[PDB]
């Protein structure tokens, strides 16, 4: 069924931040499968325990963007998440109108892997044909962005999108009001904001933005939405300015607004992709597939020169993720002579740009890591940099490389891994079991605070220790106990 | 009367190219007054003589623009001009609808000096108030130019403007058809083009362009015309593109077209003047009048530094006549210590930019020209440059300075003054009377050709020699004889 596929997707696949489909933002050690929908029903049914704080906090995760900026992905506390996912499942026949929207490019969809939200998933041919087809006969292309979107979505506006603003205000139960309550329970009983990364917040965002899409559609606008980005194709500048006005009205009705540093009108014909994308692909040494693998295999100077050219292009343009695109272009066709050189270049690029650390997972088997302890000092210097810059995805990926490849990790860099206080980093140090006593000091400092929001901020670490019998639950409810009795592990093996 | 003022203006004032109101393009030695309307009636009444060539040619005059480009002003042959001016006078009650047009900024008007066409004549306050008033509430400013205008105005389209295209085509007498014939007789019986500089061609251009102004007006466009330049103020880009379309249609109906290298749409608020104008005026040392003349008098370093800054600004922008504007800013407030320095700077600027030569007429009394023959070699080196670059206005102004200030002129530069073959230069050499024999060789080479168009190209030189009794008329008609008997002199004294 599609209800069952959504129920699997909300918990087994898209609970953790898993929207990016090329490389994940979270290392593959953390997996949210075995958190089955029946365990979510049992958690929702459980009513024990008393909480002194309204709502639940989230395990935080600062992922690095192309400009090294942090984006705070969140792992919802699972007692607050099981109710939210179960509510979205039970109400799916009244929610699936977001699937029938045609202006939302990334939306819930029955993906084969098990997910429902995968950004940048559709193939290049259809994307090109759509871009030309919608750019047919038009003069201007308007790009608009919602300012926060994740930051300031109003949860009380979830019924406003569903049955209208004034009908919902008069009505103040309906399914969308309980959805608003359950979404609020996900993040500290707070009206504004949604945790970034779970598909439940993507569904909540799609529900609110589908009314905006409906009103923009009914006024005859050619437009597409990519999460919070609206692209409009306009025969004249009348359409260009009036779409911006109507989008501003429709967002302001649901308390949202437009990012005016991201608004720009560009005369068609522009570029189907961004300009740096075609600059890289035109100069890519892999741009032609030769149908024989020896020809497809690249040389040392070819890959290195393309990587230098990508570095200059990112310094000179910087409009997008130039390094990640360029590295994905050359990463899978490396010859054995290249692997050490491109590996060290990736070490250089991963230090300077910590979002490039996941690509280091491709080469680690082919590179002989023992060497003369060069890579040993490299990964620790990266770990120190990720501790310094407060970057969670680079820290977690580097620690996944350190435990998976058994490379030792220094004490002084751990002094800042423990002091940074990223939860997912501390779960990796927790799964190592060598640093049991520095982990114990941190969790004891959390418990001695007697602040439930900090325990909810480190619920993944606390649950991993409780499931590994190294600690008891810090909660008086049965949620951790129902998780552990059924075998829920958020750091599972194969 | 206004008919009589127009009749004076066509011959006494605006026969010669005299449209510019700050400094003339022709030196003040050449004056078209004493060519009274009664002499024009007597020339028109005369029917003697036979001509083997259809129409008449014009005395040519390549004036230098801000980018050193030549513009070929023309002095119409007066037998072909008297008929044209008399025809425009007799038909003035059917022509004066061009005066009632409100979108034509430069048009026939009763000016006090005696002219009817003076470009850049209205005061700055009204121009500013108009520019703001028409820029009220609008988003875009469209600038469009007719491509040739003077070059390719179709004379057969003069009745097309007057009574409509199809009515005039069916009609193929009416006054506009004889106007078309008389305008053709001005330039070699040629359908396309108008001689630049006489007000009769300005009237002919206004007659054709007033129909374009009428159709653009009736479609509700806010627009102004400066000779061949249309500026439109647009609430949106719909108005911006549709005005360009409608102007293209209305010009193509009368066989004209749009200069598409001069078309540009600029988002308001732009600049009331051009950007270099405010850059000069903000940095002008004369920008504040102090109501006492000693304060208004400028120092040496002040004027010189402003002139250097103007030179850099013209090198760096070049969008308009930066040097002429800057020099007009400082020229009239010079202190006696400045005059030699600014004079030599003007010598430097006049050599490099020959349109700046007329400003040398302001300083020549205050500068002691005898010196050590420095200015003697300067004006001859300028004369050689004007001969080399084929610039008529610089040649004529420099020769006016040479004869008026009695400074001697070398033989070898005269070897190229005679070889350039500018008519107005040869009339200055003709009025000097020292070089009677090199003038005689040139006019004998013209007469031996037996080409009436070359005689019409040098009609001013031929008439000046005939009126000075140094030569006979080269024409079998009585036009020169009626001119000389009534005392018509085109190089008159006071």
Short mmCIF file of N, CA, C and O in Angstrom, two decimals, chain B residues 61-155:
data_model
loop_
_atom_site.label_atom_id
_atom_site.label_comp_id
_atom_site.label_asym_id
_atom_site.label_seq_id
_atom_site.Cartn_x
_atom_site.Cartn_y
_atom_site.Cartn_z
N UNK B 61 30.15 70.72 -45.22
CA UNK B 61 30.82 71.20 -44.02
C UNK B 61 30.85 70.08 -43.00
O UNK B 61 29.83 69.81 -42.36
N UNK B 62 31.99 69.44 -42.83
CA UNK B 62 32.12 68.32 -41.91
C UNK B 62 32.46 68.86 -40.53
O UNK B 62 33.62 69.20 -40.26
N UNK B 63 31.46 68.95 -39.66
CA UNK B 63 31.65 69.41 -38.29
C UNK B 63 32.02 68.25 -37.39
O UNK B 63 31.59 67.11 -37.62
N UNK B 64 32.81 68.53 -36.36
CA UNK B 64 33.34 67.50 -35.48
C UNK B 64 32.45 67.34 -34.25
O UNK B 64 32.13 68.33 -33.58
N UNK B 65 32.06 66.10 -33.96
CA UNK B 65 31.28 65.80 -32.77
C UNK B 65 32.20 65.50 -31.59
O UNK B 65 33.42 65.64 -31.66
N UNK B 66 31.58 65.06 -30.48
CA UNK B 66 32.32 64.82 -29.25
C UNK B 66 33.29 63.64 -29.37
O UNK B 66 34.29 63.59 -28.65
N UNK B 67 32.99 62.69 -30.25
CA UNK B 67 33.86 61.55 -30.48
C UNK B 67 34.77 61.73 -31.68
O UNK B 67 35.33 60.75 -32.17
N UNK B 68 34.91 62.98 -32.16
CA UNK B 68 35.69 63.43 -33.33
C UNK B 68 35.06 62.94 -34.63
O UNK B 68 35.73 62.95 -35.67
N UNK B 69 33.80 62.53 -34.60
CA UNK B 69 33.16 62.02 -35.81
C UNK B 69 32.66 63.19 -36.65
O UNK B 69 32.20 64.20 -36.11
N UNK B 70 32.74 63.09 -37.98
CA UNK B 70 32.18 64.15 -38.82
C UNK B 70 30.67 64.04 -39.00
O UNK B 70 30.11 62.94 -39.11
N UNK B 71 30.03 65.20 -39.05
CA UNK B 71 28.62 65.34 -39.41
C UNK B 71 28.57 66.35 -40.54
O UNK B 71 29.08 67.46 -40.40
N UNK B 72 27.98 65.96 -41.66
CA UNK B 72 28.08 66.74 -42.88
C UNK B 72 26.91 67.72 -42.92
O UNK B 72 25.83 67.41 -43.42
N UNK B 73 27.14 68.90 -42.36
CA UNK B 73 26.23 70.02 -42.52
C UNK B 73 26.31 70.53 -43.95
O UNK B 73 27.33 70.39 -44.63
N UNK B 74 25.21 71.12 -44.42
CA UNK B 74 25.14 71.56 -45.80
C UNK B 74 24.57 72.97 -45.88
O UNK B 74 23.65 73.32 -45.13
N UNK B 75 25.12 73.76 -46.78
CA UNK B 75 24.59 75.07 -47.14
C UNK B 75 23.96 74.90 -48.51
O UNK B 75 24.66 74.66 -49.50
N UNK B 76 22.63 74.99 -48.56
CA UNK B 76 21.88 74.75 -49.78
C UNK B 76 22.20 75.82 -50.81
O UNK B 76 22.45 76.98 -50.46
N UNK B 77 22.24 75.42 -52.08
CA UNK B 77 22.40 76.38 -53.16
C UNK B 77 21.21 77.34 -53.15
O UNK B 77 20.06 76.90 -53.13
N UNK B 78 21.46 78.65 -53.16
CA UNK B 78 20.39 79.61 -52.83
C UNK B 78 19.32 79.76 -53.89
O UNK B 78 18.25 80.27 -53.56
N UNK B 79 19.57 79.36 -55.13
CA UNK B 79 18.46 79.33 -56.08
C UNK B 79 17.50 78.20 -55.76
O UNK B 79 16.29 78.34 -55.91
N UNK B 80 18.03 77.07 -55.30
CA UNK B 80 17.20 75.99 -54.80
C UNK B 80 16.68 76.24 -53.39
O UNK B 80 15.71 75.60 -52.98
N UNK B 81 17.30 77.16 -52.65
CA UNK B 81 16.87 77.45 -51.29
C UNK B 81 15.83 78.55 -51.21
O UNK B 81 14.97 78.52 -50.33
N UNK B 82 15.91 79.55 -52.10
CA UNK B 82 14.93 80.63 -52.09
C UNK B 82 13.54 80.12 -52.41
O UNK B 82 12.57 80.53 -51.77
N UNK B 83 13.43 79.21 -53.38
CA UNK B 83 12.15 78.60 -53.72
C UNK B 83 11.61 77.77 -52.56
O UNK B 83 10.41 77.84 -52.26
N UNK B 84 12.47 77.01 -51.89
CA UNK B 84 12.07 76.19 -50.75
C UNK B 84 11.58 77.06 -49.59
O UNK B 84 10.52 76.80 -49.01
N UNK B 85 12.34 78.10 -49.25
CA UNK B 85 11.96 78.98 -48.15
C UNK B 85 10.71 79.78 -48.47
O UNK B 85 9.85 79.97 -47.60
N UNK B 86 10.58 80.25 -49.71
CA UNK B 86 9.38 80.97 -50.12
C UNK B 86 8.16 80.06 -50.11
O UNK B 86 7.07 80.49 -49.72
N UNK B 87 8.33 78.80 -50.52
CA UNK B 87 7.22 77.85 -50.48
C UNK B 87 6.79 77.56 -49.05
O UNK B 87 5.59 77.48 -48.76
N UNK B 88 7.75 77.40 -48.15
CA UNK B 88 7.41 77.17 -46.74
C UNK B 88 6.74 78.40 -46.15
O UNK B 88 5.80 78.29 -45.35
N UNK B 89 7.17 79.60 -46.57
CA UNK B 89 6.54 80.82 -46.08
C UNK B 89 5.10 80.95 -46.56
O UNK B 89 4.21 81.27 -45.76
N UNK B 90 4.85 80.72 -47.85
CA UNK B 90 3.51 80.94 -48.40
C UNK B 90 2.50 79.95 -47.83
O UNK B 90 1.30 80.23 -47.77
N UNK B 91 2.98 78.77 -47.42
CA UNK B 91 2.14 77.68 -46.95
C UNK B 91 2.14 77.57 -45.43
O UNK B 91 1.79 76.51 -44.90
N UNK B 92 2.52 78.64 -44.73
CA UNK B 92 2.83 78.54 -43.30
C UNK B 92 1.60 78.25 -42.46
O UNK B 92 1.70 77.62 -41.40
N UNK B 93 0.43 78.71 -42.90
CA UNK B 93 -0.80 78.40 -42.16
C UNK B 93 -1.16 76.92 -42.25
O UNK B 93 -1.87 76.40 -41.39
N UNK B 94 -0.67 76.21 -43.27
CA UNK B 94 -0.82 74.76 -43.34
C UNK B 94 0.39 74.00 -42.81
O UNK B 94 0.33 72.77 -42.72
N UNK B 95 1.48 74.69 -42.47
CA UNK B 95 2.66 74.03 -41.90
C UNK B 95 2.72 74.17 -40.39
O UNK B 95 3.20 73.24 -39.71
N UNK B 96 2.16 75.24 -39.82
CA UNK B 96 2.31 75.58 -38.41
C UNK B 96 1.66 74.60 -37.45
O UNK B 96 1.68 74.85 -36.24
N UNK B 97 1.09 73.49 -37.93
CA UNK B 97 0.67 72.42 -37.04
C UNK B 97 1.86 71.73 -36.36
O UNK B 97 1.67 71.04 -35.36
N UNK B 98 3.07 71.90 -36.90
CA UNK B 98 4.26 71.37 -36.23
C UNK B 98 4.61 72.21 -35.01
O UNK B 98 5.26 71.73 -34.08
N UNK B 99 4.20 73.48 -35.00
CA UNK B 99 4.41 74.32 -33.82
C UNK B 99 3.48 73.96 -32.68
O UNK B 99 3.84 74.19 -31.51
N UNK B 100 2.31 73.42 -32.97
CA UNK B 100 1.34 73.04 -31.95
C UNK B 100 1.61 71.67 -31.36
O UNK B 100 0.95 71.29 -30.38
N UNK B 101 2.57 70.92 -31.90
CA UNK B 101 2.97 69.65 -31.33
C UNK B 101 3.63 69.91 -29.97
O UNK B 101 4.39 70.86 -29.79
N UNK B 102 3.33 69.03 -29.01
CA UNK B 102 3.84 69.17 -27.66
C UNK B 102 4.89 68.14 -27.29
O UNK B 102 5.48 68.24 -26.21
N UNK B 103 5.13 67.14 -28.14
CA UNK B 103 6.17 66.15 -27.89
C UNK B 103 7.48 66.47 -28.59
O UNK B 103 8.48 65.78 -28.34
N UNK B 104 7.51 67.48 -29.45
CA UNK B 104 8.72 67.91 -30.14
C UNK B 104 9.32 69.07 -29.36
O UNK B 104 8.74 70.16 -29.31
N UNK B 105 10.47 68.83 -28.73
CA UNK B 105 11.06 69.84 -27.86
C UNK B 105 11.75 70.93 -28.66
O UNK B 105 11.63 72.12 -28.34
N UNK B 106 12.48 70.56 -29.71
CA UNK B 106 13.09 71.51 -30.62
C UNK B 106 12.29 71.51 -31.91
O UNK B 106 12.22 70.50 -32.62
N UNK B 107 11.68 72.65 -32.20
CA UNK B 107 10.73 72.83 -33.29
C UNK B 107 10.75 74.31 -33.64
O UNK B 107 11.41 75.10 -32.95
N UNK B 108 10.11 74.70 -34.75
CA UNK B 108 9.99 76.14 -35.03
C UNK B 108 9.31 76.90 -33.89
O UNK B 108 8.32 76.44 -33.32
N UNK B 109 9.88 78.05 -33.57
CA UNK B 109 9.45 78.86 -32.43
C UNK B 109 9.99 80.27 -32.63
O UNK B 109 11.08 80.44 -33.17
N UNK B 110 9.22 81.26 -32.20
CA UNK B 110 9.63 82.65 -32.37
C UNK B 110 10.72 83.03 -31.38
O UNK B 110 10.43 83.58 -30.31
N UNK B 111 11.97 82.73 -31.71
CA UNK B 111 13.08 83.12 -30.86
C UNK B 111 13.41 84.60 -31.05
O UNK B 111 13.15 85.19 -32.10
N UNK B 112 13.98 85.20 -30.00
CA UNK B 112 14.19 86.65 -29.98
C UNK B 112 15.32 87.07 -30.92
O UNK B 112 15.26 88.14 -31.52
N UNK B 113 16.36 86.23 -31.04
CA UNK B 113 17.51 86.60 -31.86
C UNK B 113 17.15 86.65 -33.34
O UNK B 113 17.74 87.41 -34.11
N UNK B 114 16.17 85.84 -33.76
CA UNK B 114 15.73 85.84 -35.13
C UNK B 114 15.59 84.45 -35.70
O UNK B 114 15.06 84.26 -36.79
N UNK B 115 16.07 83.46 -34.95
CA UNK B 115 16.04 82.07 -35.39
C UNK B 115 14.69 81.44 -35.10
O UNK B 115 13.86 81.99 -34.37
N UNK B 116 14.44 80.28 -35.71
CA UNK B 116 13.32 79.43 -35.31
C UNK B 116 13.75 78.06 -34.80
O UNK B 116 12.96 77.41 -34.11
N UNK B 117 14.96 77.61 -35.11
CA UNK B 117 15.46 76.33 -34.63
C UNK B 117 16.73 76.57 -33.84
O UNK B 117 17.76 76.97 -34.40
N UNK B 118 16.66 76.35 -32.52
CA UNK B 118 17.82 76.42 -31.64
C UNK B 118 17.76 75.19 -30.74
O UNK B 118 16.90 75.11 -29.86
N UNK B 119 18.67 74.24 -30.95
CA UNK B 119 18.70 73.11 -30.04
C UNK B 119 19.41 73.51 -28.75
O UNK B 119 20.29 74.37 -28.75
N UNK B 120 19.02 72.85 -27.66
CA UNK B 120 19.53 73.09 -26.31
C UNK B 120 19.37 74.56 -25.93
O UNK B 120 20.33 75.26 -25.59
N UNK B 121 18.13 75.03 -26.00
CA UNK B 121 17.80 76.43 -25.79
C UNK B 121 17.04 76.71 -24.51
O UNK B 121 17.25 77.76 -23.90
N UNK B 122 16.17 75.80 -24.08
CA UNK B 122 15.34 76.05 -22.91
C UNK B 122 16.17 76.00 -21.63
O UNK B 122 17.22 75.35 -21.57
N UNK B 123 15.70 76.72 -20.62
CA UNK B 123 16.46 76.87 -19.38
C UNK B 123 16.44 75.58 -18.56
O UNK B 123 15.60 74.70 -18.76
N UNK B 124 17.41 75.48 -17.64
CA UNK B 124 17.62 74.24 -16.90
C UNK B 124 16.48 73.96 -15.93
O UNK B 124 16.18 72.79 -15.65
N UNK B 125 15.87 75.01 -15.37
CA UNK B 125 14.82 74.82 -14.37
C UNK B 125 13.59 74.15 -14.97
O UNK B 125 13.06 73.18 -14.41
N UNK B 126 13.12 74.64 -16.12
CA UNK B 126 11.98 74.03 -16.79
C UNK B 126 12.31 72.62 -17.26
O UNK B 126 11.47 71.73 -17.18
N UNK B 127 13.53 72.41 -17.76
CA UNK B 127 13.94 71.09 -18.23
C UNK B 127 13.93 70.09 -17.07
O UNK B 127 13.45 68.97 -17.21
N UNK B 128 14.44 70.51 -15.90
CA UNK B 128 14.43 69.66 -14.72
C UNK B 128 13.00 69.36 -14.26
O UNK B 128 12.67 68.20 -13.98
N UNK B 129 12.15 70.39 -14.21
CA UNK B 129 10.77 70.20 -13.77
C UNK B 129 10.01 69.28 -14.71
O UNK B 129 9.31 68.37 -14.27
N UNK B 130 10.19 69.46 -16.02
CA UNK B 130 9.62 68.55 -17.02
C UNK B 130 10.13 67.13 -16.86
O UNK B 130 9.36 66.18 -17.00
N UNK B 131 11.43 66.96 -16.59
CA UNK B 131 12.00 65.62 -16.53
C UNK B 131 11.46 64.86 -15.32
O UNK B 131 11.04 63.70 -15.42
N UNK B 132 11.40 65.54 -14.17
CA UNK B 132 10.76 64.96 -12.98
C UNK B 132 9.27 64.74 -13.18
O UNK B 132 8.72 63.72 -12.74
N UNK B 133 8.57 65.71 -13.78
CA UNK B 133 7.13 65.60 -13.96
C UNK B 133 6.75 64.46 -14.88
O UNK B 133 5.72 63.80 -14.67
N UNK B 134 7.55 64.22 -15.92
CA UNK B 134 7.27 63.12 -16.84
C UNK B 134 7.80 61.79 -16.31
O UNK B 134 7.29 60.74 -16.71
N UNK B 135 8.80 61.83 -15.45
CA UNK B 135 9.28 60.66 -14.74
C UNK B 135 8.51 60.34 -13.48
O UNK B 135 8.92 59.46 -12.71
N UNK B 136 7.38 61.01 -13.25
CA UNK B 136 6.51 60.78 -12.11
C UNK B 136 5.88 59.38 -12.18
O UNK B 136 5.08 59.09 -13.08
N UNK B 137 6.20 58.54 -11.19
CA UNK B 137 5.48 57.30 -11.01
C UNK B 137 5.81 56.20 -11.99
O UNK B 137 5.07 55.21 -12.04
N UNK B 138 6.90 56.30 -12.75
CA UNK B 138 7.19 55.35 -13.80
C UNK B 138 8.42 54.52 -13.46
O UNK B 138 9.28 54.95 -12.68
N UNK B 139 8.50 53.34 -14.06
CA UNK B 139 9.56 52.38 -13.78
C UNK B 139 10.70 52.39 -14.78
O UNK B 139 11.85 52.26 -14.37
N UNK B 140 10.42 52.54 -16.07
CA UNK B 140 11.44 52.42 -17.10
C UNK B 140 11.50 53.67 -17.97
O UNK B 140 10.51 54.38 -18.15
N UNK B 141 12.69 53.94 -18.49
CA UNK B 141 12.91 55.04 -19.43
C UNK B 141 13.51 54.47 -20.70
O UNK B 141 14.62 53.94 -20.68
N UNK B 142 12.77 54.57 -21.80
CA UNK B 142 13.19 54.04 -23.09
C UNK B 142 13.81 55.18 -23.90
O UNK B 142 13.21 56.25 -24.03
N UNK B 143 15.00 54.94 -24.43
CA UNK B 143 15.65 55.87 -25.34
C UNK B 143 15.74 55.20 -26.70
O UNK B 143 16.23 54.08 -26.81
N UNK B 144 15.23 55.87 -27.73
CA UNK B 144 15.25 55.36 -29.09
C UNK B 144 15.74 56.47 -30.01
O UNK B 144 15.57 57.65 -29.71
N UNK B 145 16.36 56.08 -31.12
CA UNK B 145 16.85 57.04 -32.10
C UNK B 145 16.46 56.60 -33.49
O UNK B 145 16.50 55.40 -33.80
N UNK B 146 16.07 57.55 -34.34
CA UNK B 146 15.95 57.27 -35.76
C UNK B 146 17.36 57.10 -36.33
O UNK B 146 18.28 57.84 -35.97
N UNK B 147 17.53 56.09 -37.19
CA UNK B 147 18.86 55.66 -37.60
C UNK B 147 19.60 56.74 -38.37
O UNK B 147 20.65 57.22 -37.93
N UNK B 148 19.08 57.14 -39.53
CA UNK B 148 19.69 58.23 -40.25
C UNK B 148 19.03 59.56 -39.99
O UNK B 148 19.71 60.55 -39.69
N UNK B 149 17.70 59.59 -40.14
CA UNK B 149 16.84 60.76 -39.97
C UNK B 149 17.18 61.81 -41.02
O UNK B 149 16.43 62.01 -41.98
N UNK B 150 18.32 62.48 -40.87
CA UNK B 150 18.77 63.39 -41.91
C UNK B 150 19.22 62.62 -43.15
O UNK B 150 19.05 63.09 -44.28
N UNK B 151 19.79 61.43 -42.95
CA UNK B 151 20.39 60.69 -44.06
C UNK B 151 19.32 60.09 -44.97
O UNK B 151 19.46 60.14 -46.20
N UNK B 152 18.25 59.54 -44.41
CA UNK B 152 17.27 58.80 -45.20
C UNK B 152 15.83 59.22 -44.94
O UNK B 152 14.94 58.37 -44.93
N UNK B 153 15.57 60.51 -44.74
CA UNK B 153 14.18 60.97 -44.79
C UNK B 153 13.73 60.92 -46.24
O UNK B 153 14.45 61.33 -47.15
N UNK B 154 12.56 60.33 -46.46
CA UNK B 154 12.02 60.17 -47.80
C UNK B 154 11.19 61.40 -48.14
O UNK B 154 10.22 61.71 -47.44
N UNK B 155 11.59 62.11 -49.19
CA UNK B 155 10.93 63.37 -49.52
C UNK B 155 9.52 63.14 -50.04
O UNK B 155 8.61 63.92 -49.76
#
